[PDB]
Automatic annotation (TrEMBL), chain A:
Belongs to the betacoronaviruses spike protein family. The chain holds residues 415 to 463 of 1353 of the full protein. Specific enzymatic cleavages in vivo yield mature proteins. The precursor is processed into S1 and S2 by host cell furin or another cellular protease to yield the mature S1 and S2 proteins. Additionally, a second cleavage leads to the release of a fusion peptide after viral attachment to host cell receptor. Homotrimer; each monomer consists of a S1 and a S2 subunit. The resulting peplomers protrude from the virus surface as spikes. Spike protein S1: attaches the virion to the cell membrane by interacting with host receptor, initiating the infection. It is found in: Virion membrane; Host endoplasmic reticulum-Golgi intermediate compartment membrane; Host cell membrane. This is Spike glycoprotein. Fusion peptide 1 (FP1) and fusion peptide 2 (FP2) function cooperatively and have a membrane-ordering effect on lipid headgroups and shallow hydrophobic regions of target bilayers. They are considered as two domains of an extended, bipartite FP. The membrane-ordering activity is calcium-dependent and also dependent on correct folding, which is maintained by an internal disulfide bond in FP2.
Length: 49, 49
C-alpha cells in the first residue's frame, strides 16, 4: 500500500484486518493493465464489458 | 468483520432454538407415552403377577 497509491480499495467476503491477523494458506496477486476511469466496468460481479 | 459476524450469529441462534424446540416437543410426547405405559404396567402387575 505504501509502494503504490491506492486509487480504490475494496475487499469482498473478507476483512483486511482479519487477513493480517490470521495466516492464510495461499495469496494470489493478479497483475492487469486497467484504466482508472472505468471503475464501474471492473467488479467481482458486474455487467460491465 | 464484526457486523457481518453478528448477522451470521443471528441466523445460527434462530436455527439452534428451532432445533431445541423440536427436541423438547419430542421429549414431551415421550413423557405422555411413558405415563400411558406406566398406567398399563401398574394394571398388568395387578392383573397378572
Amino acid at each position: 500500500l505504501s509502494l503504490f497509491s491506492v486509487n480504490d480499495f475494496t475487499c469482498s467476503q473478507i476483512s483486511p484486518a482479519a487477513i493480517a491477523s490470521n495466516c492464510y494458506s495461499s495469496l494470489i496477486l493478479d497483475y492487469f493493465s486497467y484504466p482508472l476511469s472505468m471503475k464501474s466496468d471492473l467488479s467481482v460481479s458486474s455487467a460491465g464489458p | 468483520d464484526v457486523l457481518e459476524q453478528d448477522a451470521q450469529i443471528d441466523r445460527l441462534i434462530n436455527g439452534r432454538l428451532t432445533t431445541l424446540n423440536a427436541f423438547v416437543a419430542q421429549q414431551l410426547v415421550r413423557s405422555e407415552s411413558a405415563a400411558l405405559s406406566a398406567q398399563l404396567a401398574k394394571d398388568k402387575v395387578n392383573e397378572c403377577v
